[PDB]
Amino acid sequence: SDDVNGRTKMYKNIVDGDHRMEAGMPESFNVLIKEIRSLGIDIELET
Amino acid sequence: TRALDATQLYLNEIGFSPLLTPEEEVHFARLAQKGDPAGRKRMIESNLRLVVKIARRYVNRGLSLLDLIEEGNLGLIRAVEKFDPERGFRFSTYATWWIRQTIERAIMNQTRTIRLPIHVVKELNVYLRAARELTHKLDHEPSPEEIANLLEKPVAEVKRMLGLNERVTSVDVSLGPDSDKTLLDTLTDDRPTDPCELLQDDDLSESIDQWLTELTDKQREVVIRRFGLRGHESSTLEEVGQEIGLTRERVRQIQVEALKRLREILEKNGLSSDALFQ
Amino acid sequence: EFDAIRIGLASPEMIRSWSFGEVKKPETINYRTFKPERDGLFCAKIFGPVKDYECLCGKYKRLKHRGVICEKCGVEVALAKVRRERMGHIELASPVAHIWFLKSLPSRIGLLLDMTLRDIERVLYFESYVVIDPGMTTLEKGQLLNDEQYFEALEEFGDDFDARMGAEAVHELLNAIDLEHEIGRLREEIPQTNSETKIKKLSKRLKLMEAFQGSGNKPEWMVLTVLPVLPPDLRPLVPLDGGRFATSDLNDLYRRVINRNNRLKRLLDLAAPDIIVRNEKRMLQEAVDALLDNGRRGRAITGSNKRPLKSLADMIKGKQGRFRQNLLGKRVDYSGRSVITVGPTLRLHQCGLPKKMALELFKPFIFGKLEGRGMATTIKAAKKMVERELPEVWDVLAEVIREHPVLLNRAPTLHRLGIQAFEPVLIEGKAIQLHPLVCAAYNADFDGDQMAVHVPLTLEAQLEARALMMSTNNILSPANGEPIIVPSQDVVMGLYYMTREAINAKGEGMAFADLQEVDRAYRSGQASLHARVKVRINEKIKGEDGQLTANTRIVDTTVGRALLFQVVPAGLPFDVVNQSMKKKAISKLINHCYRVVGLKDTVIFADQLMYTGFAYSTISGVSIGVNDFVIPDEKARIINAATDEVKEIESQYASGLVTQGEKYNKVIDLWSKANDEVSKAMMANLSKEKVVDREGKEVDQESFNSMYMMADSGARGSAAQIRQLAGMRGLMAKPDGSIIETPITANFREGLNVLQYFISTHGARKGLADTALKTANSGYLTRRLVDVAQDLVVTEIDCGTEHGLLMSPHIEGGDVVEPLGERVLGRVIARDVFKPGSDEVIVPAGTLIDEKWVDFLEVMSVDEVVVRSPITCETRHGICAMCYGRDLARGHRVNIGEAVGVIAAQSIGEPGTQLTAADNVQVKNGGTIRLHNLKHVVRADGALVAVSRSGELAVADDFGRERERYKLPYGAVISVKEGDKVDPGAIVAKWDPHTHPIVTEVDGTVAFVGMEEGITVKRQTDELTGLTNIEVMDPKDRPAAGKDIRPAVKLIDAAGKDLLLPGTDVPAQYFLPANALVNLTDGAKVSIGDVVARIPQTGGLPRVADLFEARRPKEPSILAEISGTISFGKETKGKRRLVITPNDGSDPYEELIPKWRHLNVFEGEQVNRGEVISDGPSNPHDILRLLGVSSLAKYIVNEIQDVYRLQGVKINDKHIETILRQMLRKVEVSESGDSSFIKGDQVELTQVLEENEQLGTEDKFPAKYERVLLGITKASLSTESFISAASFQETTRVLTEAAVTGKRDFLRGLKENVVVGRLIPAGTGLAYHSERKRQRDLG
Ligand SMILES: [Mg+2]
Ligand SMILES: [Zn+2]
Ligand SMILES: [Zn+2]
């Protein structure tokens, strides 16, 4: 749930026969970033 | 702790203004025509008590209280710049037409979420007024075909004009007594969003280009030239035949022969085209 | 990847880097065509294209060029996902102030600008002026101006007076803040003012002004000029049926600002007067204010409606009630719910699944098997094969169901056993076939319940679901050592009838060769199911590790008991099946079978025990009828006798010799005493309801009634429910709080009356009202414990320290409640336990205690052992594996990475829905007398009077401590001496509970000094000389002269010399309290031990939730501050003053005691810091400060578990002490040098600084700390992360503090990775975070 590229790439792994389990990114957090940056408060990823 | 407000602070600021008499406005308007810095300040500040009563007349409209008073002030600045003191017109009567003109323009351009042109928004003003009188005259609901007969208009014209006002509502506002879920969680997309539908179009594209490379050699370049499945651009029969085959009927004879061959491949492979298209 | 999510300020130069275009036109879509326009809120040039690989005008639409810009329309071709990433910006002509830093509770601008809260809005609204950079002038920047003040100051000074008003004035003050020089003024004026209110406001300013220097955020960035916009996909414009669109309310707020921002630029380009400019700037402030938040002061109303518009900040608060989308319910795929159904033909590790559900859940798995086999060529042809229901799709479907553990869960999940993995079996029907034994863990009955399913896709999830989530692994409950897979009511019924004793039966007296001869003789119809026979079996004992001996024993048991031993494996003796096999008797057999055999042979034994329980339950057709409810014939004798006794009480009340309050209590106890006689006569008839004969006249045995078998076996119901069917129901109390006097004499068999049934509706309706509310109170208790215990995952194997509390069994009352074998079951030993002898050691290293060492302690007389508990650990940010116990679903020790903080909070909140004189003491078990911490004086007559209230008279057994232990009050009479013989039923102590005696120091005469005849002392007598003593006067009824006077009876010798007590310099003079009477007159010899004066004197969820909150009660208990002599101060000031005069060091201050409550403290008595002074409950804060840190954990365990003990649930002590570790984490400071005076710092931060200052330049820099107690709600607010703190707390309160501080927060913990979406370090994810931290600037 809450993905765009992760769900499509996972469905191909089930048909191929090997479960790669790609990481992806949840869509519930990508929306929260765009809503926070639009309020005048900064948020970034230091990594 | 004092009272903090927006409409109350502006009403007290305009109260400390001098009175405008008829024997003084004739001299102020005469000096403003020649061009002076003090002429525009004293003439615009003396008429601030007039736009507050005109903007308050259009209550219960799309614009708020501060939106009507501020927009009406732009018409007063333009009125004192185009006034003709030699014509003998009144300074207060000439500015009344400019204050009322700027108010009606902001309603037809800022109330609705979709800006409508001016030459088409005036046709809807007389349609709403004609439907208001016909509502209480017939003691029934305003029908779409009933206004067409009263205003002498076709049924196809009133259906599109009365249907132009969509009256869009909010989405986050939920319906019902309990607000358990909004309308954001009830909408769906029109394109293919399911993972199964996105995989069928990708697997079929990788098989169509693969079946053409294994079908034949001379017939493969003819189907790729007619239909750009390998990234090529689509061309007509006369454009494709001018550079290959040098004829208009030689490129079509091979097309039907290769079409019957691919028809037998999809039948024995298990595609079952007779059941899909039915 | 990414890590260390930080929060800072949005700089105006950085906002322009995020945006790609400037939004200037408010219109979005054309009227005729449905296409966006340039420079709009939905434009394609700024945000991106609408369709996939297509521009607006349609010039470039090929799929070849990935990135290109069209010459006609300036739009870059891309996918449809780019429209959610790119943002815009609106460049305002005039700056606007942010509202998050203005209307919040902490005014970030008020303390920084040294202004008031109301002054910030006074300048922004163009009401009052303010001068900046005055220099050498009379006014400064701190002073305010007005309409008449600004005009007079301009003509007075003229120069060096720069005054501004509006948003530009605050922006000018925030620009030239000079934070490098402003910090020097705060560090010099802090110790100058000694006022507490002045040093608190100055400490908050330095805490925030220093955050802007280290984080790099300038104070001028709080105000903004250009603001970003939301992507157009988050506020979409999707059409509906009929050509009607749907606009989001967030787009209306953005369109209102652009309509006013463009008017500001047009008005400022024509030399407009300053009066009209302030009107527009005030409208722009309200527009931006209504765009961020809404509903506080603005409350913007939309068109054709009345509800306020939800803004951006309101969208986060409105998202599932001030929470995140990840913390709320999320819709997941590969799931499905249906009605459950019991299946007796399934194994313990597998379950049932319909054929129609398996085709939809495993749909992607069928497409992969058909392509690899060769039947389906493409994926489109395989879709028409699973929807056609062919005969070859079922053979390939069962290939992926063989090994694929699916998940099962119910709607309410209150423990870890609610989600278990099973192996699905293809069954026909539309219901989930569930195992009968597993229903005890789900706590679900078969009445229409629905259980959802889950299918793991990744093979990594299939391995952790088979080894951890399997139903065969979680055979033991996580709460205690009792197994959760126990035979239920239906299985225990067939096993109880199989193991039964009978006097006469068919085939009794014969012998058999082995167990093979018993089964053949029974199924042949020639032998009864239970007959006294004798058999010889070949049993194997597993007492030796790795060796299985064989022994033959000829035992004489029943026929059914020999058949049950066939299911029992060869690792248990035959004595375990010789009982009646009740429910509580079989729960200990599985717990013993799993401990001495293993897990592989226990699952097979649990399945064969269920198979033999259902097969033998159908053979015995047990049924309940009207003849099974045996009504006792003597029941009518008790009712007719009690009916004549109540009429005698009513005949007396008619006259008036007895009051109403006396007759009410004298009749409500008669029916309670008569209810015992009815139940005693029923159990004596129901148990002996069998008459048999075997070569004799009469012989009695156990009854074979159907009602007795369903009550003695504990299958369904208890002994309290059988009394409602056989005997009377009792006194049905009203829900108002009072008990109804009229009882219900009739039972369920004889039928209730009309008025008797209406009374039963009162208690039945009140029970259903508390059941629905029990799910909200117990659900709220488990929601606060998991939020404080979310970061307590085990990370270390062993600390290396020896710090633990003592463990002693419950010796309260007459007998013991919980022995030492249950409290020290599965815990490591802290120190080396010593033998009760001279000098011998048992545990040389102090390792863990298994089930073998439990019985080993029963051989010796050891009673006091110390164990390492998690409340006294030494690790940092975690809990060691050695300090934690071993009570888990498995039998071995804990693992490195198991989240013990979550499994301990669920074990407490799960059973929450099941929750709601002494004058002379005697002994029960004879033994010796063992005194501890008590001092008394022996009298010449034989009595013993103790002047201490902390004396505990404990009874000792012949080998050590007995099961009896009592407490001795102050001034009690103990005729028995310490260290005597045993005495059963004797009296060892006697005292008065109402009259409080006063102890005497020595003998001799007494002289009353300080007595005022009329103000302090008043000689009063009774009728006919009834009471003739020296009665003192009250403190309020005294005169003005005797208001502060207090008498004190001095004790001296008879010869005339002053006598004093040894130890103290001042004599021991007894004071005269109020309403006191002296038994002996002044000048008479009084012996020791005589009374000097006579001073006469709720449970369930609200009790457990109050102890975890550590809330101060209404009437706390006042304890002593230090040991020493106690005395009274001045009582004329309206309150009592209590001072302590120790022998080593006294104290200048004295505690004040109020006059509202009583005071049991006596003057001249050696008080201690242990016992209490005032009666009533004791506050938990006084135990940690005065008694210790190890005593607080003992008080909570002995109080929280006592609430769960009244119901019968068993919760281990390792889960209660686990939550106590988090509440005792933060500590206080009492010495400066490194931080402020009063600051709440964690113990992990103080220990890393105390040990560092010992090895450095200055060793005196280290300061001491003191432990403080915090509630479960207060300790949860100390989260260093902001994503885990914004879940339960306010969103605008955590984000505002995290912005002005600039704290770069990492993703360490468990609640942080759930919202983000990364792996969880608890469990199998510990190896992932270990490799990530290792390869990070370490090598
Ligand atoms: Mg149910
Ligand atoms: Zn274009
Ligand atoms: Zn530890």
Write the DSSP assignment of C1235-1256 as a string of letters: S-SS--EEHHHHHHHHHHHTSS
Residues C236, C237, C243: CA angle, nearest 5 degrees: 155
Chain-chain contact of A42 with C229 (C-beta, under 8 angstroms): no
C617 close to C493: Cβ distance less than 8 angstroms: yes
Eight-state DSSP code of residue B46: H
Two tokens, residue C678: 């009815």
C873 close to C799: Cβ distance less than 8 angstroms: yes
Two tokens, residue C629: 């409810």
CB of B265 within 8 Å of any CB in chain C? no
Rounded to the nearest 10 degrees, what angle do helices B48-55 and B91-110 cross at? 40
Q: In chain B, which residues have their Cβ closer than 8 Å to the Cβ of A8? A: 195, 198-199
What number of residues does chain B have? 278
Positive or negative: CA dihedral C244, C248, C249, C252: negative
Q: Which residues pair with C952 in a beta bridge?
A: C932
> Would you call C1181 exposed, middle or buried from its count of C-beta atoms within 10 A (0-12, 13-18, 19+)?
middle
> From the CA of C439, which ligand is nearest?
1
Question: Residue B13 to residues B16, B17, B19, B20, C275: CA-CA distances in angstroms?
Answer: 6, 8, 15, 17, 8
For residue C1051, give the nearest of C1014, C1016, C1078, C1018 by alpha carbon. Answer: C1078
C499 close to C913: Cβ distance less than 8 angstroms: no
Helix (H) or strand (E) holding B207: helix B195-215
Chain-chain contact of B198 with A12 (C-beta, under 8 angstroms): no
Look up tokens 């009394």; give the residue. C723
Count the Cβ atoms, other than its own, within 10 Å of residue B263.
10
Two tokens, residue C1202: 């006592």
Residues C622 and C615: their CA atoms lie apart, in Å, by 13
Eight-state DSSP code of residue C543: E
Please report which residue ranges of C1206-1242 form alpha helices under DSSP H: 1213-1223
Residues C830 and C851: their CA atoms lie apart, in Å, by 18
Look up tokens 């969880």; give the residue. C1320
DSSP, residue by residue, C736-799: TSSBPSS-B---TTT---HHHHHHHHHHHHHHHHHHHHHHHHHHHHHHHHHHHSSS--EEES--
- What type of residue is C500? R
Write down the number of H helices and E strands in chain C.
37, 42
Chain-chain contact of C271 with B6 (C-beta, under 8 angstroms): no
CB of B26 within 8 Å of any CB in chain C? no
C169 close to C281: Cβ distance less than 8 angstroms: no
Pairing of strands C162-164, C130-132: antiparallel
C15 close to C226: Cβ distance less than 8 angstroms: yes
> Would you call C1062 exposed, middle or buried from its count of C-beta atoms within 10 A (0-12, 13-18, 19+)?
exposed
Eight-state DSSP code of residue C309: P
- What type of residue is C575? D
Residues C1263 and C1253: their CA atoms lie apart, in Å, by 10
C505 close to C557: Cβ distance less than 8 angstroms: no
Look up tokens 């012998």; give the residue. C511
Count the Cβ atoms, other than its own, within 10 Å of residue C931.
18
Q: In chain A, which residues have their Cβ closer than 8 Å to the Cβ of B196? A: 11
C393 close to C363: Cβ distance less than 8 angstroms: no
State the resolution, in angstroms: 3.9
CB of C227 within 8 Å of any CB in chain A? yes
Please report which residue ranges of C293-376 form alpha helices under DSSP H: 312-317, 355-361, 363-373
Q: How far is A1 from chain C (nearest CA, A)?
A: 6
CB of B6 within 8 Å of any CB in chain A? no
C351: annotated binding-site residue? no
C235 close to C84: Cβ distance less than 8 angstroms: no
For residue C443, give the nearest of C899, C913, C765 by alpha carbon. Answer: C913
Q: Is C162 left (phi over 0), alpha (psi -120 to 50) or beta?
A: beta
Two tokens, residue B260: 């019957």
Residues C1292 and C100: their CA atoms lie apart, in Å, by 7
> Would you call A17 exposed, middle or buried from its count of C-beta atoms within 10 A (0-12, 13-18, 19+)?
exposed
Q: In chain B, which residues have their Cβ closer than 8 Å to the Cβ of C310? A: 172
C782 close to C776: Cβ distance less than 8 angstroms: no
Instruction: Please state the separation of Cα C304 from the chain's center in Å.
Output: 48
Pairing of strands C936-938, C130-132: unpaired
Q: Is C546 left (phi over 0), alpha (psi -120 to 50) or beta?
A: left
Helix (H) or strand (E) holding C988: strand C987-990
| Ligand 2 centre distance from Cα of residue B205 (Å) | 28
B224 close to B233: Cβ distance less than 8 angstroms: no
DSSP, residue by residue, B51-74: HHHHHTTS-SSSS-HHHHHHHHHH
Pairing of strands C936-938, C944-946: antiparallel
Positive or negative: CA dihedral C963, C968, C974, C978: positive
Question: Taking the CA atoms of chain B, what radius of gyration do you get in angstroms?
Answer: 35
Look up tokens 């249907």; give the residue. B163
Q: In chain B, which residues have their Cβ closer than 8 Å to the Cβ of C295? A: none
Chain-chain contact of B195 with A15 (C-beta, under 8 angstroms): no
- What type of residue is C1137? R
CB of C381 within 8 Å of any CB in chain B? yes
C1309 close to C791: Cβ distance less than 8 angstroms: yes
Two tokens, residue C362: 């495993």
Look up tokens 């021991």; give the residue. C1068
Look up tokens 């220099």; give the residue. C135
At residue C1191, what are phi and psi to the nearest 5 degrees?
A: -80, -20
Two tokens, residue A2: 């809450």
Eight-state DSSP code of residue C1232: -
For residue C1281, give the nearest of C1261, C1301, C1259, C1255 by alpha carbon. Answer: C1301
H, E, C per residue of C364-381: HHHHHHHHHHCCCCCHHH
For residue B248, give the nearest of B257, B256, B240, B259 by alpha carbon. Answer: B240
Q: Which residues pair with C453 in a beta bridge?
A: C336, C408
Q: Which residues pair with C541 in a beta bridge?
A: C549
Two tokens, residue C1267: 């432990």
Please list, in sequence order, all residues whose beta carbon lies within 8 angstroms of the beta carbon of residue C809, skipping any fewer than 6 positions away: C816, C817, C818, C819, C820, C823, C863
At residue C777, what are phi and psi to the nearest 5 degrees?
A: -80, -40
For residue C483, give the nearest of C437, C536, C424 by alpha carbon. Answer: C437
Residues B155 and C354: their CA atoms lie apart, in Å, by 58
Please list, in sequence order, all residues whose beta carbon lies within 8 angstroms of the beta carbon of residue C1181, skipping any fewer than 6 positions away: C1110, C1112, C1269
Which chains sit next to C, with 3 or more Cβ pairs under 8 A? Answer: A, B
Residue in B with minimal Cα distance to A12 = B199
DSSP 3-state assignment of C262?
helix
Please list, in sequence order, all residues whose beta carbon lies within 8 angstroms of the beta carbon of residue C601, skipping any fewer than 6 positions away: C569, C571, C593
Please list, in sequence order, all residues whose beta carbon lies within 8 angstroms of the beta carbon of residue C165, skipping any fewer than 6 positions away: C123, C126, C128, C129, C130
Half-sphere exposure of C809 (CA within 13 A, CB side): 20
What number of residues does chain C have? 1339
For residue C904, give the nearest of C561, C486, C480 by alpha carbon. Answer: C480
C593: annotated binding-site residue? no
C53 close to C191: Cβ distance less than 8 angstroms: no
What do you get for the CA distance between the two ends of chain B, in Å?
79
Two tokens, residue C909: 């909140």
Q: How far is A15 from chain B (nearest CA, A)?
A: 10
Question: Residue C485 to residues C588, C604, C609, C611: CA-CA distances in angstroms?
Answer: 12, 13, 12, 14
What burial letters (b/e) apply to C1158-1178, b meaning 16+ CB within 10 Å? ebebbbbbbbbeeebbbeeeb
Please list, in sequence order, all residues whose beta carbon lies within 8 angstroms of the beta carbon of residue C379, skipping any fewer than 6 positions away: A15, B199, B200, B203, C367, C371
Residues C765 and C759: their CA atoms lie apart, in Å, by 10
Chain-chain contact of A36 with C1295 (C-beta, under 8 angstroms): yes
Q: Which residues pair with C1127 in a beta bridge?
A: C1139
Two tokens, residue C916: 């709601």
Chain-chain contact of B199 with A10 (C-beta, under 8 angstroms): no
At residue C1128, what are phi and psi to the nearest 5 degrees?
A: -105, 145
Maximum Cα–Cα distance across chain A: 47
Residues B245 and B252: their CA atoms lie apart, in Å, by 10
Look up tokens 């400390």; give the residue. B16
DSSP 3-state assignment of C651?
helix
Please list, in sequence order, all residues whose beta carbon lies within 8 angstroms of the beta carbon of residue C657, skipping any fewer than 6 positions away: none
Residues C1330 and C1325: their CA atoms lie apart, in Å, by 9
DSSP, residue by residue, C144-161: ---HHHHHHHHHHT-SS-
- Chain C neighbours among B 216-245 (CB < 8 Å)? 231
B125 close to B104: Cβ distance less than 8 angstroms: no
Instruction: Give the 3-state secondary structure percentages of chain A, helix then strand then coil, rounded to 5.
Output: 50, 10, 40
Write down the number of H helices and E strands in chain B.
14, 0
Residues C438 and C417: their CA atoms lie apart, in Å, by 10
Residues B240 and B248: their CA atoms lie apart, in Å, by 9
Look up tokens 């309603």; give the residue. B107
B66 close to B121: Cβ distance less than 8 angstroms: no
Pairing of strands C432-434, C335-342: parallel
Could you list the beta-strand ranges (E) of C999-1076.
Answer: 1006-1009, 1030-1031, 1048-1051, 1070-1071
Two tokens, residue C901: 């903080």
Residues C970 and C1219: their CA atoms lie apart, in Å, by 37
Half-sphere exposure of C981 (CA within 13 A, CB side): 2
C368 close to A17: Cβ distance less than 8 angstroms: yes
Two tokens, residue C844: 């040389």
Question: Residue C84 to residues A5, A34, C230: CA-CA distances in angstroms?
Answer: 14, 8, 9
For residue B69, give the nearest of B10, B123, B112, B17 by alpha carbon. Answer: B10
At residue C1337, what are phi and psi to the nearest 5 degrees?
A: 55, 30
Chain-chain contact of B73 with C276 (C-beta, under 8 angstroms): yes
Residues C803 and C1013: their CA atoms lie apart, in Å, by 61
For residue C169, give the nearest of C125, C124, C135, C139 by alpha carbon. Answer: C124
Q: Is C320 left (phi over 0), alpha (psi -120 to 50) or beta?
A: left
Q: Which residues pair with C19 in a beta bridge?
A: C87
Q: Which residues pair with C955 in a beta bridge?
A: C929
Two tokens, residue C80: 């449809």
Instruction: Please state the separation of Cα C895 from the chain's center in Å.
Output: 24
Positive or negative: CA dihedral C384, C388, C393, C397: positive
Residues B185 and C595: their CA atoms lie apart, in Å, by 52
Residue in A with minimal Cα distance to B195 = A8
Eight-state DSSP code of residue C190: T
Helix (H) or strand (E) holding C904: helix C900-909
Look up tokens 């939020």; give the residue. C787
Residue in A with minimal Cα distance to C88 = A38
For residue C468, give the nearest of C483, C478, C457, C453 by alpha carbon. Answer: C478
Residues C595 and C904: their CA atoms lie apart, in Å, by 23
B138 close to B93: Cβ distance less than 8 angstroms: no
Look up tokens 């000689």; give the residue. C1019
